[PDB]
Design a protein around this ligand. Structure first.
Ligand SMILES: Nc1ncnc2c1ncn2[C@@H]1O[C@H](COP(=O)(O)OP(=O)(O)OP(=O)(O)O)[C@@H](O)[C@H]1O
Ligand SMILES: Nc1ncnc2c1ncn2[C@@H]1O[C@H](COP(=O)(O)OP(=O)(O)OP(=O)(O)O)[C@@H](O)[C@H]1O
Ligand SMILES: [Mg+2]
Ligand SMILES: [Mg+2]
Lengths: 97, 13, 47, 257, 257, 13
DNA sequence: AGCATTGCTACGTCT
């Protein structure tokens, strides 16, 4: 407490849970839909885009949903959150899938 | 449309 | 034994010829192969 | 009295035109057209029997005056350890013939005689895994000598039985797999049950995502679980004076599995 | 003399209306309405068989003039390694028919004939684990060809037999477990066995909390240990000329284990 | 209340 | 047509 250079900023918990694991050099489909590790996915705003390289972030302990990212102006920018096709009544983990 | 198991027998008969 | 365990995953009939057919192409290396071939290769000089 | 009639309705069974049933019916129409023998395989209570039963009611016998009936599809469920005379007796009795005591050869010839003339073109054998190993040779000869698409129905225990006989496995390789269902079509199927099957006076709102969760956990995608839970939940709720199925009863049922 | 008549009742068996039995009877009533096949499970001597017999008796055969009896509940216990013929024989004899000589096919057709018309609506199979693996197919055929709720009763030994056939497992999935008693329910039960069962000449006051340790250590909460202890002690007390179960007698009995 | 197997054999039997 | 991405299998290599 006396040795830190100045009082650090206490970050929002959700921000580290945005610091999820990510996958890259994947592509969005030419539609409202997605894929990951033979799971198949839907996304609310993906239909505005043709098939293109995409980046995506996921909780390995809750692969029920993914956060999707785009490289706007050479910077990562949010596309949308996304879900497995029809999956809502239950939740899934990555290791068991 | 409903398809009652007894009506299938009645139709099949 | 080991062929009989795994060959049933093919649904094959188990017989003299089918276990032979499961042996004649075992040339298709790993530790237990290394050990046994070396271990056999020691004794075969006996005459 | 209101209750006893509706209870007796819920106590009986019903049939619902699910996409799996529609898929099988088109597949069986292709096999019957081609005279292709095949097997239908899938886990218990996935609805194979109800689907095969609905197929024979859709292709009912045609009667013409003074002839034996034209019966394109014959459906049999063998008794356990069915021998050849048992099999022949099943087929001849389905075609509305009485068996006369005689040898296996006599039962065979009489069955072959009436499989012709009744114009049979598909024979569905439900739970074919009940057949003795020797009676599979008569099943194969029906498929080979006559122009009849034999359909074997069973669980993966059927696949165990036929893989033990090379000649049966190779004749019945063409197969359709019945699946358990989850998500969207499951949600539709739950909604279809409360719309078309339960018919309770007041809405149970089983479409509700939390109700779909507990049903997902208990029914585990088997249509024969989904039907039995809702029917049992209806009888309890009606008997307890409730116009509705609701979680207080539905989860008492769901915990019972 | 008095003492030998008390021994003659104390060596007998009786029925006590425990809440466990009541709970089963409400459940079996619900299954019998829905025709829901199910199972009753739980450790040995937990009271399952006595609770099933009590359900048979309260739903006894109803006579109708010149008709076969209406027998809503059939209870059977198979002999060990019960085959199909053995099953059919026990069902038909329970309905007060005589089996003739015949094939399994004759026995089956006769059993299905008398399961109809006698109006059977529940079949309880106690020691259901004694059924041969092949005869469950006939049990399953009864459950779905007729509107009969089949109740399989066994210990966890039955669940091993059931899970070896997924067609049985998926038909009898709904279950009720008889558990061991504890605490106030055990205390009330122990109180009942003094004041209702033994009805002994002088009280032992079995609400006593300390000696309840002696019972628990022998009894483990099994009713079929509890009912055994007190009859052993009472016969000894009345043989020894003791008007009560003394601690010296209870602990001596409870020490035989 | 309690019951005897031998009574039940006559009474229900 | 063209590949192009997607989901496994090493063969290390390190704690
Ligand atoms: N299409 C359907 N419409 C309505 N109810 C259905 C349907 N399919 C299944 N059921 C319900 O589920 C139960 C089980 O279905 P079914 O008897 O067809 O199963 P199965 O696959 O033949 O089973 P098994 O392999 O165990 O013999 C039915 O008895 C009925 O209660
Ligand atoms: N409700 C009861 N009233 C009176 N005696 C009982 C009762 N339940 C159990 N018993 C006594 O305990 C014994 C065990 O009961 P029961 O035979 O019903 O158990 P079970 O669980 O069916 O046993 P198992 O699985 O070993 O065949 C009976 O023989 C009887 O002596
Ligand atoms: Mg079936
Ligand atoms: Mg018992």
């Amino acid at each position: 407490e006396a040795g830190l250079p100045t009082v650090p900023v206490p970050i929002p918990e959700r921000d580290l849970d945005i610091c999820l694991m990510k996958q890259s050099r994947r592509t969005v489909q030419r539609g409202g839909c997605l894929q990951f590790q033979n799971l198949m996915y839907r996304g609310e705003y993906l239909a505005g885009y043709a098939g293109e390289t995409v980046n995506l972030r996921f909780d390995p302990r809750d692969i029920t949903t993914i956060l999707v990212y785009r490289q706007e102006n050479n910077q990562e920018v949010f596309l949308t959150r996304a879900h497995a096709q029809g999956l809502e009544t239950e939740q899934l983990a990555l290791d068991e899938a | 449309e409903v398809w009652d198991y007894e009506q299938l027998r009645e139709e099949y008969g | 034994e080991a062929a009989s365990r795994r060959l049933r995953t093919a649904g094959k009939t188990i017989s003299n010829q089918s276990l032979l057919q499961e042996v004649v192409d075992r040339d298709a290396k790993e530790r237990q192969k290394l050990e046994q071939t070396v271990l056999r290769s020691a004794a075969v000089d006996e005459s | 009295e209101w209750l006893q009639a509706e209870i007796a309705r819920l106590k009986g069974k019903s049939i619902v035109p699910l996409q799996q049933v529609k898929t099988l019916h088109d597949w069986l129409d292709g096999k019957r057209k081609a005279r292709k023998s095949c097997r239908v395989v899938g886990e218990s209570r996935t609805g194979k029997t109800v689907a095969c039963d609905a197929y024979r009611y859709r292709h009912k016998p045609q009667q013409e005056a003074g002839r034996p009936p034209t019966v394109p599809v014959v459906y049999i469920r063998p008794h356990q350890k069915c021998g050849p005379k048992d099999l022949f007796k099943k087929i001849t009795e389905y075609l509305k013939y009485r068996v006369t005591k005689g040898t296996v050869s006599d039962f065979r010839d009489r069955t072959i005689e009436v499989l012709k003339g009744c114009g049979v073109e598909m024979l569905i054998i439900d739970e074919a895994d009940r057949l003795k190993p020797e009676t599979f040779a008569d099943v194969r000869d029906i498929a080979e000598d006559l122009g009849i698409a034999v359909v074997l129905v069973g669980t993966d225990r059927l696949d165990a039985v036929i893989k033990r006989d090379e000649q049966v496995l190779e004749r019945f390789r063409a197969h359709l797999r019945f699946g358990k269902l989850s998500g969207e079509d499951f949600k539709n199927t739950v909604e279809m049950w409360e719309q078309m099957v339960l018919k309770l006076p007041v809405s149970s709102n089983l479409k509700s995502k939390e109700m779909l969760r507990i049903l997902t956990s208990a029914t585990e995608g088997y249509i024969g679980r989904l039907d039995e839970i809702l029917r049992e939940a209806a009888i309890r709720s009606l008997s307890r004076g409730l116009k509705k199925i609701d979680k207080a009863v539905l989860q008492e049922v769901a915990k019972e599995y």
